[PDB]
Structure formats: structure tokens, C-alpha cells
């Protein structure tokens, strides 16, 4: 599993801020847009993109305040990310896309797809966000930490002062041990505590027990859309998984239209770090049939 990030930096101005992105692959055809979540960046896709680039353009932005993108003075709520990703996609002139999405990247991607359904040719996803009605249904592994992240005062000390989303959640949610080199790539955007606002706001935006109400309603809306959409869907899942354990992959197989699923072996949440080759090779095999 490679640790380098051998991608030439690209930048585009978006609502006054520079956003960094990977851009590789042929200059025509439908582009494949890769959307990371918390607390990662385009680095999470580094070993997946090379499987897809031979046949399709690959675009992987760093969300605002993350990766090599700029750090505007935002709250970094989901609605801020929606604005910056919408403007990123328009600034690149993208028309139709295939989405490859994870974590908060999946909330962004599914919300964009519901609003722009004519422009989405397929969605590959993994360990994605859906509304969780009670804490008892939130995944048990690290559950008390997520409760504390959403507790006033306590959560900021954990995430902002102690950097626990990077130093604890991220390695705990990969089955294989992340190396120090990989950890240093993930640490780089957050070396100062004043850069860590997005990492704290994200878990405070998760749709749990109806709160926050605005994210809850938007996630319920894209899940209704997903259950009715004919779009081709590709779900990657691992075991024991975090948000999508085997029994949840089964419920997806039994409910979602036009779905193919791929088991990746051992995995928790950041499945890309456990088996990037199965993820990238199966995306590559599935793309031709999107016509
Ligand atoms: Cl989060
Ligand atoms: Mg500037
Ligand atoms: Mg270029
Ligand atoms: Mg910078
Ligand atoms: Mg293995």
C-alpha cells in the first residue's frame, strides 16, 4: 500500500479561496469525482486513483479547510462545504460525473446527486452517512468518543486541543496499522490547533436523533432519493465495518435499486487504507457499463 502522493497540485479559486485537487487521466469522457470526508483529504484516494486514471479522468478535491485547500474563516458546517463543493464543480466546468464518495464526502455527493440527478452517471460509495435515529443505533466502536465530541466544551478540547480525530479516530478506524509516514500526511493540514475547526464541526453535524435538524432533513431527503433512483450504484463494505457492518450491507442489497456490492475483506471505516486495490480495480471494472 503506497504512502507517497505523486500527484501534481492543481488549484482553482472558489468563492475567494483556493481549493487544491488531483487531476489525472484522459481529458475527455465522463470524469470520476472522488470526495473524501473527516479528517482526511485527497490523500485517502491516492492508491485508488491509479486504477481508474488509465481509462477516466480523476478529480479529487480537498474540501475547504482540509488538505492543501485554503482555510477561510468559516464555521465549516455542512452547508459551508456544500457551497464550496458546488462552486468547485462549476469552476471546473464539469457537466456529467461519476461520484466516488465516503463519510462526509458521501453526504456531499448524495446531496449534489439529488439536486443534479441528470448529471450523475453512477455512484460508488462506502461507509456513508445516513440518519441514525438513536445513539443505541450509532456504531458501538468509539461511540462514547462521538458522544463526547458533541458535548459542549469537552468536544473542542478533544478535537481542537488534543487532535483526537487525527491521532485516535483515524488509526482506530483502519484495521491495518497506519505508518508514521501516512500519519504525517494526514497531520500536515492540522499542525496548528486553530486549523482544526472543520474536524470538530463535522462530528457536530452528524445526523443523530434528529439533530442538527437541517442536516437531518437533507440526509433523509437524499436517502429517499437513493432508494428511488435508477442510477447505477456500487457499494464497498468491510468487516466488521463501522457505519456499514455486514448486516447493513445486507439491508442495502435488499432495498436499493441497481446496486452492486463488493466485499473488501477486513475493514472498519477508512476502507481505502485497508484494501485500495480491490476498491480501485472494481471501480475500474464497473465504469464501462455506465455507458
Ligand atoms: Cl465526523
Ligand atoms: Mg487567495
Ligand atoms: Mg493538469
Ligand atoms: Mg495552503
Ligand atoms: Mg488483507
Numbering used by the authors: 4 to 294
Quote the paper:
First, DhaA115 displays activity toward a broad range of halogenated substrates, many of which are toxic and carcinogenic compounds persistent in the environment, e.g., 1,2-dichloroethane and 1,2-dibromoethane. This makes the enzyme particularly valuable for biotechnological applications that detoxify and degrade harmful pollutants.
Moreover, the removal of 3 mutations possessing a low probability of substitution (D11P, A212D, and L221I) from DhaA222 resulted in a further increase of thermostability by 1 °C (DhaA231). The analysis supported our conclusions about the disruptive mutations and, more importantly, succeeded in identifying three additional false positives, as demonstrated by the improved stability of DhaA231. We obtained diffraction-quality crystals of DhaA223 and DhaA231 enzymes that belonged to the space groups P1211 and P212121 and diffracted at 1.5 and 1.3 Å resolution, respectively. The positioning of catalytic pentad residues was not disturbed, which is a prerequisite for efficient catalysis. We show that the mutations designed by FireProt and PROSS stabilized the native state of DhaA115 and increased the unfolding energy barrier, shifting their maximal activity temperatures above 65 °C. We also observe that the stabilization of DhaA is accompanied by the destabilization of an intermediate state based on the increasing cooperativity of unfolding (most noticeably for DhaA231).
